[PDB]
Subunit: 105 residues, 3 copies
Amino acid sequence: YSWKGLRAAWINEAAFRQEGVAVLLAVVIACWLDVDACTRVLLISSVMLVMIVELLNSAIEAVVDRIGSEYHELSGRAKDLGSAAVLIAIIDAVITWCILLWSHF
Amino acid sequence: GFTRIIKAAGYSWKGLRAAWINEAAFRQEGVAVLLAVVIACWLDVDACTRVLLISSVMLVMIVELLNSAIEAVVDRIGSEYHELSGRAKDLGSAAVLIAIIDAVITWCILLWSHFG
Amino acid sequence: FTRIIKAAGYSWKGLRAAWINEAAFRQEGVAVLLAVVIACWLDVDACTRVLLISSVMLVMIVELLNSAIEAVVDRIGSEYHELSGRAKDLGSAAVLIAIIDAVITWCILLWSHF
Ligand SMILES: Nc1ncnc2c1ncn2[C@@H]1O[C@H](COP(=O)(O)OP(=O)(O)CP(=O)(O)O)[C@@H](O)[C@H]1O
Ligand SMILES: CCCCCCCC/C=C\CCCCCCCC(=O)OC[C@H](O)CO
Ligand SMILES: CCCCCCCC/C=C\CCCCCCCC(=O)OC[C@H](O)CO
Ligand SMILES: CCCCCCCC/C=C\CCCCCCCC(=O)OC[C@H](O)CO
Ligand SMILES: CCCCCCCC/C=C\CCCCCCCC(=O)OC[C@H](O)CO
Ligand SMILES: CCCCCCCC/C=C\CCCCCCCC(=O)OC[C@H](O)CO
Ligand SMILES: CCCCCCCC/C=C\CCCCCCCC(=O)OC[C@H](O)CO
Ligand SMILES: [Cl-]
Ligand code: NA
Ligand code: NA
Ligand code: NA
Ligand SMILES: [Zn+2]
Ligand SMILES: [Zn+2]
């Protein structure tokens, strides 16, 4: 499952690796900045949220491919919707980091 | 290959229109969400509070999009197969509810502490 | 308002379904109750209290989405007779990251308070 899924996500999905690095960067940076606990949490969790949604998107993509590689309007709808969910998470992470850092750095 | 980043962006945007055009729940929650975001940007609150007000509400949109994706998959199954238990869609609806409840709690707790 | 009652009944049906079939959801249900009580019984500020609860609530949300994905796979698995696991693996991975995130949240916040 989880550890197995993470391994699959890392090797197979390139977007996931970039997020993994981003999580590592977020944690290191959040710990290096002189900020309060809530801020430190918000900096890390927001980026981890992107990874969570990305994994779910990858899961949906796996189901759709399993149904069929062939082209349908509901197959690509699902993948688009999943892709859209990741975007909002990223938008959320950008807004979060902006608001917090605009005050400190 | 920065070119692909644009490929992925077009996807998400296509998904957004699809959620908007096809899902009514997405249209109504989006209005409440976008309204909430605007208010959160204009309140006299600290950064952490402003972030919590926005993120809790945007999470509702994230979960809804994931719910819509799951519904799309189910509908894809339903076009080939005849019998739909509805269980997958029920769970997706449950996920959105918990997200909305969470957003209500977040806004209640935060607004009650500063303005209380 | 008619659809809202219908959408709520769906959600409630999904919540009840999750409770009976998945033991992990019952544990998370317990954890949410504990998180709220603990956050409300500690003398902490609003932002930390929101984060203590929301981090745990996120785990329940991801689990519900994961269970939905599992249900779809099973419906397909009943038709094609296929036992590939990536959809279920990835869904479980998403829940793990949510749990790890919640642990970090509780650690960082409580280490700062105490
Ligand atoms: N079976 C299918 N039927 C219809 N459209 C499909 C499809 N498979 C893919 N598409 C379309 O192509 C896009 C890319 O497919 P897919 O979602 O699998 O991308 P991907 O895994 O390469 C990138 P990412 O993981 O970042 O989302 C989808 O967003 C959708 O618009
Ligand atoms: C104001 C500055 C704030 C900076 C900090 C904000 C938080 C980090 C943002 C996103 C995490 C993930 C990064 C983007 C993930 C890759 C994008 C993607 O999915 O692209 C398609 C794929 O890469 C095909 O190659
Ligand atoms: C104060 C308010 C400031 C607000 C500022 C907000 C500006 C937009 C921010 C980030 C966009 C980053 C680029 C978009 C990310 C790539 C597209 C995407 O979502 O790709 C997912 C991909 O398919 C993988 O699954
Ligand atoms: C202590 C007093 C404090 C009071 C402050 C409370 C403010 C709640 C704020 C945001 C919730 C946002 C929820 C966004 C999603 C809900 C959408 C929804 O359910 O909409 C109803 C539907 O449209 C009908 O037809
Ligand atoms: C201050 C800024 C306020 C901004 C405006 C906020 C207005 C709405 C508030 C609460 C509505 C709560 C609604 C709760 C009903 C949920 C129904 C449900 O379970 O829906 C499942 C979902 O629709 C499946 O997609
Ligand atoms: C500060 C205010 C805090 C407010 C409190 C936080 C609310 C958390 C939300 C949902 C929990 C739902 C738990 C799952 C319930 C499922 C239904 C159930 O128990 O079903 C069993 C059934 O009886 C078998 O026959
Ligand atoms: C400070 C310790 C106080 C003692 C009591 C703590 C309980 C409060 C809940 C969560 C804490 C953070 C844990 C992070 C994950 C929470 C959800 C979780 O682990 O749920 C069970 C899981 O699904 C596997 O079955
Ligand atoms: Cl059980
Ligand atoms: Na159609
Ligand atoms: Na729907
Ligand atoms: Na299960
Ligand atoms: Zn993919
Ligand atoms: Zn995709």
